[PDB]
């Protein structure tokens, strides 16, 4: 039944990796079409029985934050655009307009009076104003997680269904910097039939244009059958503005942007202005315009032509609506009445274009090619590759993944119950979803906005995190308190969240210490949540005010624990060293939590007057010349000192790691007998060019290969414990930490680029794996795509997004690096992986931001590093464009993106506390996730509805029997099920009524949505 995603290489007309291997990428001057050629056409192609049908589609690109904040743009620009669109479309029944960004549209519509809301609904209902995509934003496609692309699509489309009674089936993505197949994947599973893209490499546009392959059926790289295919239109020219949308010659097209005559403060760079259309010049003007159109039409297969008419924050002033509409109407009247042109031109919408194209297709006038692959890394000209934004503003890139998980956890924890309106649960969740959705914008997560705009996004995300926390902690109190005792105050904090990795040690002192003492409080309840649908163990840590603390479960069973010091690193501006200081009053307690699928587990921390039986203490070794003492208060083991030296550590039965005298990994030995496999971490720096084009927020233009960071003799701290050991080193700009808990290590970098201008800090792994020119990186946390390093392209072109992981492998060995944040990276030589940590750039890179990147702040980046033998794995053939994780690497990714949540009871005594929730939840196969659980109804609905998105990844078969799990039927997770339906991923359309009210599990690489109804 399920397609095999490993063993069958899809047959497609265009496969982008194969295309890349054969293309030359020469940047030659093509004439007026600078990156193309002089298009020729036969005037006799079109005649009375075969006309060229031209749709001119007015639009206005509205950024939800970029050079101004969302609200600043709304007040200065977008409210006027929407108000004038309402008036002008109402008064001119033939005029049309498309709208993409529902964040703005919702902000506007809710401020309208009823009379105007009704006028607005009427111009939508009658097809004059058409929503395209309908997401909250037009998201970045490189750094965004697929879960958040879905979240923002759903937020916008749910608003549209509710208020406008429409669901777009055509997507418009004119602005993201390069394009991902994650988009057609999600859109096709959300009812879409068509999509449009624009920012692809100029060489790719030229190559596909030559073959008339700019319209294609875009399927996923593993899809043999083609059921994922989505019809895609790629625009052919350098920009989506008017000069680059009428045809190949911008000097001509610019004369048809009637906003550029002077009074609006705009002009044509090509030095020939628009002229008002009159009876005396309409023939000559129409000659010029129709020639452009016929040239553009040569690049496509049907007699239906799309002509976008818009640009950034256009259609603001009434006078602008008039100047565009009246002049185009005069052109249409002339062109359409002159039989010799054999053109019928008119204003249209995006859907009208695609409907006409498919009519031509069904008439047998065209067949379209199939395509798989992606469209990264984008270059718009010369060697200007937009790989800088894979890293820019990495603090907020990390924040995105933290909030991603908090939103999921809050929606899931609160979904189990119906909530009174006074609890404000729906209100807080809507705020959290909207702020996370806003940040998916192609100037949000990308790090390409002005400083004060980044601050705005950060503030919004902080508010969203507080909202998630409130919802989460109220939900835990309800789920774990005896119902007849449960007595909620919906404003009260029953628990506080404890997060060990955000903002992170050295970033913010934000974690509460659990305060215990014989004269204040003997013990404290803590609760862990596991959002994943399988039983999970994970080490968890809390700060406590005594080293003498023991852990129990709620059956009072002792739990083995480890206590370690609290270490903070300081750039000592007196001694000019970076070194750690230990607390003499706060300590870390660490223990293994075991939590049910989608469940909760309670533990108790209790103080005693001396070392407890079931708690051990880590040893600590500070390696440096010229040590001074490090007292640790009551901590029972004295810190040891030594000169820098190589060291080796092993936790449990796990790998043995060896480190250099500078505290950096040099080798990994998987088992007792096995080789010490060379795996070396190194930090390097890229610079900026001193002549020619400068790196900025968008572009990465290095002045050659990276140079090693000079390390000096750094201070190394080794902590050795039964449950957790670590090696931490204070390097220039980076406190680098390797943590061992018995499996693949965790890596944490506290990155503070300080005042190092024009520097990019990279973390590289050096191995002897014979990977050649091949490596793999993920797309949106959804799939791994094969990359080939191309020495015919510059270094920055071989950088790709690393939104969640990357790997290299040979016949026998693979190294996978999983990330807790999207960053840029590559494999620039056989056996290497590298990933950029931060970048600080003094110059603007001429893309409109008008500033460099000088607002850096300390960030804690997190990773897992998985070395594995892969000789026994069933891998795709050499020609397959995909790769797949192993079980260990997938689990390591989940440990970073969706860790256990930790809650500390806030008061002294928790009356009616219970030990566990979800112990009867099915424990699903490891490749299955419940990506979303969301209650879709408020408490006043007679029939309650709960939505689930179920995703199954595909993990490699490597010989592990891995057995007995339970079937997960999401429709039976809540009692009193009356109906189970399969829906689109946005939950907005029912696709199948399910027998037995049973939701089937999905196939590998598939994602399905289900809604259960409850009486
Ligand atoms: O590029 C990614 C970006 O795409 C869209 O926005 C693109 C904008 O492109 C054009 O503006 C580029 C110029 O903008 C500035 O204001 C300046 O920063 C300028 O640089 C000069 O000055 C710099 C000072 O630091 C200097 O460093 C540099 O060397 C330059 O000398 C930029 O060159 C425009 O197309 C702009 O659109 C406005 O202007 C149009 C032309 O007049 C109008 O037709 C239009 O209505 C609008 O008023 C674009 O906004 C967005 O998609 C964005 O999301 C994305 O990040
Ligand atoms: C919404 O659209 C449908 C047609 O798609 C129509 O039948 C219905 O009356 C419209 N108004 C609603 C649903 O309120
Ligand atoms: Zn934009």
Domain ranges of the chain: 1-382, 383-493, 494-618+899-920, 619-898, 921-1015
CB-ligand 1 contact for 443 (6 Å cutoff): yes
The string of DSSP letters for 409-435 reads: HHHHHHHTS---GGG-HHHHHHHHHHH
CA count, 13 A, side-chain hemisphere, 736: 23
Query: Relative to the CA of 63, which ligand 1 atom is closest?
Result: 54
Element (H, E) at 154: helix 146-164
> Is the shortest distance between the CB of 314 and ligand 1 below 6 Å?
yes
Protein residue closest via CA to atom 49 of ligand 1: 312
CA distance 893 to 866: 10
Ligand 3 centre and the CA of 931: distance in Å? 29
Evaluate whether 471 touches 409 at the Cβ level (below 8 Å).
no
Q: For 388, phi and psi rounded to 5 degrees?
A: -65, -40
Nearest-CA residue for ligand 1 atom 47 is: 312
**Strands of the sheet with 977-983, listed across from one edge:** 928-935, 944-952, 1007-1014, 977-983, 990-993
Q: How far apart (Å, rounded) are the C-alpha atoms in residues 536 and 878? A: 35
Residue 895 contacts by C-beta under 8 Å, 6 or more apart in sequence?
538, 746, 864
Using the mean position of ligand 3's atoms as its centre, give its distance from the Cα of residue 848 in Å.
10
CA atoms within 13 A on the CB side of 216: 28
**CA atoms of 982 and 880, how far apart (whole Å):** 31
Task: Report whether 617 contacts 636 (CB < 8 A).
Answer: yes
Residue range 383-493 forms a domain whose CATH class is: mainly alpha
Kindly report the CATH number that applies to the domain delimited by 494-618+899-920.
2.60.40.1180
Q: What are phi and psi of 432, to 5 degrees?
A: -60, -45
Contacts of residue 402, Cβ cutoff 8 Å, sequence gap at least 6: 465, 499, 502
Task: Give the number of the ligand closest to the Cα of residue 166.
Answer: 2
Q: Which of 615, 671, 620, 681 is nearest to 865 (CA)?
A: 681
User: What is the side-by-side strand order in the sheet with 194-197?
Assistant: 14-15, 370-372, 215-218, 230-234, 194-197, 170-173
Reading the block at residue 839, the tokens are 């970048």
Burial of residue 43 (number of CB atoms within 10 Å: 0-12, 13-18, 19+): exposed
245 neighbors 235 (Cβ within 8 angstroms): yes
Dihedral over Cα of 195, 199, 201, 203: its sign = positive
Please give the structure tokens belonging to residue 833. 């992986």
User: Closest ligand 1 atom to the C-alpha of 448?
Assistant: 56
> What resolution does the deposited structure have, in angstroms?
1.6
For residue 257, with 0-12 CB atoms within 10 Å meaning exposed, 13-18 middle and 19 or more buried, which class applies? buried
| Burial class (CB within 10 angstroms; exposed 0-12, middle 13-18, buried 19+) of 660 | buried
Residue 178, C-beta contacts closer than 8 angstroms, at least 6 positions apart: 141, 142, 199, 200, 201, 374, 375, 376, 377, 378, 386
Output Rg (C-alpha) for the chain, integer angstroms. Answer: 30
**Tokens read off for 517:** 């003492």
Q: What is the DSSP letter of 699?
A: -
Which 3 state secondary structure label does DSSP give 497? strand
User: What whole-number distance in Å separates Cα of residue 1010 and Cα of residue 992?
Assistant: 9
Task: Provide the token pair at 138.
Answer: 């037009």
**Residue written as token pair 């078969």:** 957
State the distance from the centre of ligand 3 to the C-alpha of 252, rounded, in angstroms: 25
Residue 350 contacts residue 300 (beta carbons within 8 Å): no
Instruction: Identify the burial level of 46 via C-beta atoms within 10 angstroms of its C-beta, where 0-12 means exposed, 13-18 middle and 19 or more buried.
Output: buried
Residues whose CB falls within 8 Å of the CB of residue 633, separated by 6 or more in sequence, listed in order = 547, 583, 584, 585
Instruction: Using the atom order of ligand 1, give the atom closest to the CA of residue 313.
Output: 46
Mutate to test the pocket of ligand 1, among 141, 172, 384, 848 (most ligand atoms within 8 A of CB): 848
All residues at 6 or more sequence positions from 693 whose CB lies less than 8 Å from its CB, including other chains: 382, 383, 384, 699, 701, 845, 846
Distance from Cα 139 to the centre of ligand 3, integer Å = 9
The answer for residues whose C-beta is within 8 angstroms of residue 508's C-beta and 6 or more apart is none
Closest CA to 523 of 576, 450, 470, 602: 602
How far out from the chain centre does Cα 611 lie?
46
**In angstroms, what is the span from residue 66 Cα to ligand 3's centroid?**
8
Which CATH code, of 3.40.50.300, 2.60.40.1360, 3.40.190.10, 3.40.50.10470, is assigned to 921-1015? Answer: 2.60.40.1360
SS3 percent helix, strand, coil of the chain, rounded to 5, is: 25, 30, 45
CB 78, CB 108: distance < 8 Å? yes
Residue among 264, 312, 453 to mutate when testing ligand 1 (max atoms within 8 A of CB): 312
**Hey, whose CA ends up nearest to atom 51 of ligand 1?**
175
Structure tokens at 498: 């404890």
Cα-flanking dihedrals φ and ψ of residue 749, to 5°? -120, 120
List the CATH code of the domain at 619-898: 2.70.98.30
How many whole angstroms separate alpha carbon 631 and alpha carbon 608?
21
Q: How far is the CA of 441 from the centre of ligand 3 (A)?
A: 8
Q: Which among 234, 340, 350 has a CA at the least distance from the CA of 291?
A: 340
Which pair of structure tokens corresponds to residue 286? 């129409």
Phi/psi of residue 484, each to 5°?
A: -70, -5
218 in contact with ligand 1, CB cutoff 6 A: no
Same topology between domain 494-618+899-920 and domain 619-898 = no
Instruction: Put residue 26 in one of left, alpha, beta given phi > 0 → left and psi -120 to 50 → alpha.
Output: beta
Tokens of 68: 């101004």
Which two structure tokens, joined as six digits, stand for 787? 């990359």
Alpha carbon distance 1011, 992 (integer Å):
10
CB neighbourhood size of 13 (10 A): 13
Do residues 711 and 662 make contact, with C-beta atoms less than 8 angstroms apart? yes
Protein residue with least CA distance to atom 1, ligand 1: 847
Neighbours of 440 (CB within 10 A): 27
- Any ligand 1 atom below 6 A from CB of 847: yes
CA distance 659 to 644: 11
Q: Is 117 exposed, middle or buried (0-12, 13-18, 19+ CB in 10 A)?
A: middle
β-strand pairing of 52-61 with 304-312: parallel
Q: Which atom of ligand 1 is nearest to the CA of 698?
A: 2
Residue 989 alpha carbon to ligand 3 centre in Å: 30
Please give the Cα distance from 81 to 92 (Å, whole number): 16
Strands 615-617 and 561-572, bridge-based pairing:
parallel
Alpha-carbon distances of 859 from 505, 736, 759, 980, rounded to whole Å:
10, 12, 16, 44
Phi, psi of 986 (to 5 degrees): -85, -5
Q: How many whole angstroms from 860 Cα to the centroid of ligand 1?
A: 33
Phi, psi of 228 (to 5 degrees): -80, -5
What is the atom index within ligand 1 of the atom nearest the CA of 849?
A: 18
The answer for residues whose C-beta is within 8 angstroms of residue 752's C-beta and 6 or more apart is 733, 734, 856, 857, 858
Q: What is the DSSP letter of 971?
A: G
What backbone torsions phi and psi does residue 945 show, to the nearest 5 degrees?
-130, 135
**Cα gap 745→737, rounded to integer Å:** 10
Cα-to-centroid distance, 990 and ligand 2 (Å): 16
Do residues 873 and 958 touch, judged by C-beta distance below 8 A? yes
In the block, tokens 């003498």 appear at 548
Beta pairing, strands 725-731 & 716-720: antiparallel
Ligand nearest to the CA of 388: 1
Residue bearing the CA closest to ligand 1, atom 12: 848
Distance CA 745, CA 477 (A): 34
How far apart, in Å, do the first and last CA atoms of the chain sit?
A: 33
- Which of 1005, 550, 958 minimizes the C-alpha distance to 779? 1005
Name the residue with the closest Cα to ligand 1, atom 30: 846
Q: In sequence order, what DSSP letters do the residues of 57-94 get, joined into one string? A: EEEEE--SSSSS-HHHHIIIIIHHHHHHHHHHHHH-TT
b/e map of 71-106 (b: 16 or more CB within 10 Å)? eebbeebbbbbbbbbbebbbebeebbbbbbbbbbbb
Q: Omega into 396 within 30° of 0, i.e. cis?
A: no
Q: What are the tokens at 182?
A: 């994650």
Check if the beta carbon of residue 475 is closer than 8 Å to that of residue 417.
yes
Any bridge partners for residue 708, and if so which? 684
Token code pair at residue 959? 């010989």
* Cβ-proximal residues to 941 (8 Å cutoff; 6+ apart), any chain: none
Looking at CATH, the fold of the domain delimited by 1-382 is given as 7-stranded beta/alpha barrel (3.20.110)
For residue 266 and ligand 1, the question of a CB distance below 6 A is answered with yes
**Residue for token pair 């407890």:** 612
Tell me the two tokens of residue 504: 């992170």
Between CA 482 and CA 636 the distance in angstroms is 40
603 touches 526 (CB < 8 A) = yes
User: Could you tell me where the DSSP H helices lie in 424-501?
Assistant: 425-439, 451-479
Residues in the chain: 1015
Question: Is the CB of residue 950 less than 8 Å from the CB of residue 931?
Answer: yes
Contact 929, 910 (CB under 8 A): no
- Any atom of ligand 1 within 6 Å of the Cβ of 63: yes
- What would the two tokens of residue 884 be? 């797949």
Local structure of residue 790 (DSSP, 8 states): -
């Amino acid at each position: 039944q399920c397609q095999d995603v490993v063993q069958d290489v899809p047959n497609v007309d265009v496969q982008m990796l194969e295309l890349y291997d054969r293309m030359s990428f020469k940047d030659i001057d093509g004439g007026v079409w600078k990156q193309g050629w002089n298009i020729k056409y036969d005037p006799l192609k079109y005649n009375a029985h075969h006309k060229l049908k031209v749709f001119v589609v007015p639009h206005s690109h509205n950024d939800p934050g970029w050079i101004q904040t969302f609200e600043e743009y709304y007040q200065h620009d977008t409210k006027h655009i929407l108000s004038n669109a309402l008036r002008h479309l109402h008064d001119n029944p033939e005029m049309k307009f498309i709208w993409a960004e529902i964040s703005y549209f919702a902000r506007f519509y809710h401020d309208l009076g009823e009379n105007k809301k009704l006028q607005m609904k009427s111009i939508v209902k009658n097809g004059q104003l058409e929503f395209v995509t309908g997401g909250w934003v037009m998201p970045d496609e490189a750094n965004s997680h697929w879960r958040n692309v879905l979240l923002q699509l759903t937020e916008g489309q749910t608003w549209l269904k509710q208020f406008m009674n429409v669901t777009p089936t055509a997507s418009w993505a004119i602005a993201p910097f390069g394009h991902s197949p994650t988009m057609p994947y999600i859109l096709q599973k959300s009812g879409f039939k068509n999509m449009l893209i624009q920012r692809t490499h100029y060489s790719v546009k030229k190559e596909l244009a030559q073959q008339r392959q700019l319209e294609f059926l875009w399927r996923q790289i593993w899809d043999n059958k083609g059921d994922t295919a989505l019809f895609t239109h790629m625009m052919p020219f350098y920009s989506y503005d008017i000069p680059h949308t009428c045809g190949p010659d911008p000097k001509v097209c610019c004369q048809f942007d009637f906003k550029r005559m002077g009074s609006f403060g705009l002009s044509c760079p090509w030095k020939v202005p628009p002229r008002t259309i009159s009876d005396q010049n309409v023939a000559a003007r129409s000659d010029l315009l129709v020639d452009q159109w016929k040239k553009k039409a040569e690049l496509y297969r049907t007699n239906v032509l799309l002509i976008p008419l818009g640009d950034d924050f256009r259609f603001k002033q009434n006078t602008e609506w008039d100047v565009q509409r009246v002049n185009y109407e005069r052109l249409f009247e002339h062109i359409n009445s002159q039989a010799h042109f054999n053109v019928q031109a008119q204003f249209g919408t995006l859907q009208e274009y695609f409907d006409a194209v498919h009519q031509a297709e069904r008439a047998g006038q065209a067949e379209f090619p199939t395509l798989s692959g992606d469209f990264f890394t984008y270059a718009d000209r010369s060697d200007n590759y937009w790989s800088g934004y894979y890293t820019s503003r990495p603090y907020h890139k990390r924040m995105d993944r933290v909030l991603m998980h908090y939103v999921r956890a809050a929606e899931m924890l609160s979904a189990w119950h119906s909530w009174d309106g006074m609890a404000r649960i729906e209100e807080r969740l809507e705020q959290a979803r909207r702020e996370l959705s806003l940040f998916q914008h192609h100037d949000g997560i990308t790090g390409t906005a002005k400083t004060h705009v980044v601050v705005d996004y950060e503030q919004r995300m902080q508010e969203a995190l507080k909202a998630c926390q409130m919802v989460m902690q109220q939900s835990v109190y309800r789920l774990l308190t005896k119902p007849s005792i449960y007595s909620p105050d919906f404003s009260f904090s029953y628990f506080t969240l404890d997060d060990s990795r955000w903002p992170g040690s050295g970033v913010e002192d934000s974690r509460t210490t659990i305060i215990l003492g014989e004269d204040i409080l003997p013990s404290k309840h803590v609760v862990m949540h596991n959002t994943l649908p399988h039983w999970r163990e994970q080490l968890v840590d809390f700060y406590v005010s005594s080293p003498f603390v023991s852990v129990t479960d709620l059956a009072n069973n002792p739990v083995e624990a480890q206590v370690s010091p609290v270490w903070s690193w300081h750039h000592d501006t007196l001694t000019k060293t970076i070194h750690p200081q230990g607390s003499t009053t706060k300590y870390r307690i660490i223990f293994k939590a075991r939590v049910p699928p989608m469940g909760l587990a309670t533990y108790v921390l209790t103080i005693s007057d001396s070392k407890p039986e079931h708690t051990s203490y880590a040893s600590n070794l500070l390696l440096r010349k010229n040590p001074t003492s490090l007292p640790l208060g009551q901590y029972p083991e004295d810190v040891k000192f030594g000169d820098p030296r190589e060291i080796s550590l092993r936790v449990g039965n796990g790998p043995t790691l060896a480190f250099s005298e500078q505290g950096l990994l040099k080798s990994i030995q998987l088992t007792q007998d096995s080789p010490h496999v060379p795996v070396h971490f190194k930090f390097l720096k890229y610079g900026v060019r001193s002549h020619g084009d400068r790196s900025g927020a968008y572009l990465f233009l290095p002045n050659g290969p990276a140079s090693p960071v000079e390390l000096g003799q750094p201070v190394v701290l080794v902590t050795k414990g039964k449950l957790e050991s670590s090696v931490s080193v204070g390097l220039p700009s980076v406190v680098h930490q390797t943590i061992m808990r018995g499996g693949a290590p965790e890596i944490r970098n506290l990155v503070d680029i300080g005042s190092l201008d024009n520097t990019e800090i990279v973390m590289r792994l050096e191995t002897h794996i014979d990977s050649g020119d091949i490596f793999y990186t993920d797309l949106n946390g959804l799939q791994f795509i094969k990359r080939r390093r191309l020495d015919k392209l510059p270094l920055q072109a071989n950088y790709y997004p690393i939104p969640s992981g990357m790997f290299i492998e040979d016949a026998n060995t693979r190294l996978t690096l999983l990330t807790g944040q999207p960053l840029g990276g590559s494999s620039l030589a056989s056996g290497e992986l590298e990933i950029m940590q931060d970048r600080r750039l003094a110059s603007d890179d001429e893309r409109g931001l008008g500033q460099g990147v000088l607002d850096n702040k300390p960030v804690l980046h997190i990773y897992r590093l998985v070395l594995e033998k892969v000789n026994n794995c069933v891998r795709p053939s050499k020609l397959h464009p995909a790769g797949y994780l192993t079980s260990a690497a997938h689990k390591a990714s989940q440990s970073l993106l969706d860790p256990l949540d930790k809650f500390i009871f806030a008061e002294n005594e928790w009356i009616g506390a219970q030990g566990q929730f979800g112990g009867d939840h099915p424990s699903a196969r490891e490749d299955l996730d419940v990506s979303v659980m969301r209650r879709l109804t408020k408490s006043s609905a007679k029939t309650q509805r709960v939505g689930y998105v179920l995703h199954r990844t595909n993990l490699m078969q490597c010989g592990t029997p891995e057995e007995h799990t339970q079937k997960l039927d999401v429709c039976h997770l809540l009692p009193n099920v009356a109906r189970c339906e399969r829906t689109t991923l946005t939950f907005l359309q029912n696709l199948e009524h399910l027998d037995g009210m049973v939701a089937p599990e999905v196939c590998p690489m598939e994602t399905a949505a289900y809604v259960s109804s409850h009486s």
